[model samples]
Target: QTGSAPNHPSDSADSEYITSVSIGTPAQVLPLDFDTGSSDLWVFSSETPKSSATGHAIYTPSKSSTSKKVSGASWSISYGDGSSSSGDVYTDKVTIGGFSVNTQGVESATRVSTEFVQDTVISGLVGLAFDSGNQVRPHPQKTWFSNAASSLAEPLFTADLRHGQNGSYNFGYIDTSVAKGPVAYTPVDNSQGFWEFTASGYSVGGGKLNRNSIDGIADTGTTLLLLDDNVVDAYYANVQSAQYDNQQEGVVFDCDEDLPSFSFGVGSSTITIPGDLLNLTPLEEGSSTCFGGLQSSSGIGINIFGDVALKAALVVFDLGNERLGWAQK
Candidate 1:
């Protein structure tokens, strides 16, 4: 059967795309960030400190008759942004859209980062990455998608994230109507539990495709498009007022400047990023300077095609075939 969930932007524009998921018996629903970068289905819970659980939906295992503790199972994770969460574990009925995964291992957060604690709307994370990244102790647990893949009409999922608008996550099938043309497929190296592929090349403005192959992962949980430092420098060199900001540790430029479009290659096709998308909006209102949506993938060894890049097209995570499909929308 097919299932789909509406994806909405968080309070911040051009930021995280979140959707609703239900857990436990009688269905305790909560808004969760559907993250494709990592694996671990975790949520705010009664075990989470009250200070961190405030303004969030807490999953109380005791309240759900179907919730069962997974003895000796625990989980902890640290994100690329330095945010983290850790807690005990339980097996419960987890539902996304209308599809159900019985006995899904759900991590109950007992500790969360300051950033997560302050979040008023997002309550949890639904990991869609490979099951190898699962952090549960005693034995790593499988993700809901992996556990339910066999029952799905098609073992695939699609991520359609829009900037400041409602998009969707489609399961079991690809809605060809949403994409502009035939998808360009690329093989994935799932060794790191990431959907990583090699981008053929990239161009700044309407320049020629430079044939610079970049190994990167399509990560929906990330906010910016992070490429190699050299590549980032090359792209910014063409922008009139663009410069590296020491304080921000990223590129910043005049918000009003007429920017050029950027494009990246996949197989024989290309995904273009319009000039306007380069300016990620000002740090505050009325500011002349704005943070760039593209940054250097410095410490992180691999490039990341984050929300900024993903929003420019329709991305299909073809798990069944171990491939990724990119199409302009």
Candidate 2:
């Protein structure tokens, strides 16, 4: 199962990362977001009402000879952002890159949230988190990663996320040549069904590493880097024109202002996110208020090192070793 897939950014700020996934017999190719935050391989499908399936590639299970309907199985999922989707389940031949899962759980979305409908770049999501977080019931199903883990040359995957371009998701091995320094490894706590790990700390503008412990997940699904409210406030304080914009419900700054870089501790190694990368995008046409890529995680209860943080380094989701690897790229 030594496979790889090109991870493509859906927008300029890399709002989402997507890869093509082939499912069922004769291969029904669909653009699927590789989300490590959740564990349910759900897709917009033929079962969805015509009104809800606009501008998407619908998976028709009946047309695929290898598709098998699961008995009394249904799944309803509400993401941390309030995005929800629900539907029945089917087992199909799901393949990503060259790796193939003979009978992978493929949830068919009969109902979708407005967010899902609007995000037209992707037809579904392929969750890479632990199987425990899967929503399918009467029986929870294994994730696409879990089903392919045993067959993989190495029981791991590496994410090399690029800004507004193609990166890569290596399923079975880590490419040593991609990083600038040695990989920093740290233990992962999967009890909550995520690549959850405790980061040593962070610093602003290439400053010395802060020693506070920051527990968070390496989530590819999320677009922003969510951290403790205090840290978030501290980082934005460095910006001369920064303010907690209540209208935007987050921090914003003058678009033309030069900003400072953000650094986070990964084990003993430090990865720095450049100041410019922190500016997600301009709030509006010809507007000066720019949204910050870093946000507060008070409501989430846990910090999330999402795409904004991920693009700064080569991240390894090492399931076999029960650890996460970080390296500067």
Candidate 3:
């Protein structure tokens, strides 16, 4: 979490700051979360008011030698919180660490959520949702992936997202170096950007926590690891010190000592979560609580592994790689 940027929907620093992501002719190399939840490319701008933090990475049009902006296209996005942002569309002839995916879509935010504007160090959200799965109302603008006319015409791209260490994800190819013997390919559910999988069970430290297991959707668009509340209760109970603070986001643990690791299973296979990640998230300044990577909801019965949990492991969303690759660090 050290080098990560921080931008929220309700922050004072949500306006001018934006992460400088790379894209263009080769792969559009940029700092993308490789989210499998939603598809979109968002960024902040110099034209925005300085009052908003927009903290993650800032993009300066003046700085990019190959940057270009799309004319006459502006966009707005709304979250479940009902808060959102709107901005103009731009194109950049991006260059990043020797890789490039041509004519990538970018956003210059004009308005943003207070949480987004005020964050001291966060950047904008990038929807890693799948393309051809979902599209918002109106023409085009079906998230960032739909904006590029040329990219759209070229057919969807399959990212052979590697499942391994911090730097193991290769956009279009699997990083075989980190392979755990053989790969188990989960069939992809073309629903929105969700990477759906049937759950064998839910557990904490190799023990079952929930019996009412169902299929799970691996979503990169969502930031939190969502699970059934009942399942969460059982998982949190094992932590012994898990408690939800006033924020209502989830439970929290004061210290990071002797915490247990959690895991989600698919048949005999299991994915383990580290103690630090299990008990600490963005609860407060220097404080994290034990949390179930999932939250229960009437609308959702399937266990949902959002971005928080997804990032904990090396995930390979191999559209081309065939099964979902999950590797823990």
**Can you give the TM-score per candidate against the true fold?**
0.97, 0.97, 0.68
The C-alpha stretches of model 2 lying farther than 4 A from their native spots are: none
Task: Give the Å error, residue 251, model 1.
Answer: 0.9
lDDT string, candidate 3, 95-140, tens digits: 3223344555666676778866755454455555555543332333
Candidate 2: clashing pairs of residues? none
Say which prediction, candidate 1 or candidate 3, comes out ahead on lDDT: 1
lDDT order, best first, reads 2, 1, 3
lDDT of 2 by residue, 1-329 (tens): 49888888898768999889999888999999999999999999999877878899879999999999998999999998899999999999998888898999999999999988988878989999999999998999999999999989989999999887799998998886878977899999999999999989888888799898799999999999999988998898869899888898888999997888889888878888988788998998888889999999987898999999998888999989999998887
RMSD from true fold, candidate 3: 6.8
Tell me how far the alpha carbon of residue 248 in candidate 3 is from the true structure, in angstroms, after superposition.
Answer: 4.7
Error of 2 at 33 (Å): 1.2
Q: What overall lDDT goes with each candidate model?
A: 0.88, 0.90, 0.51
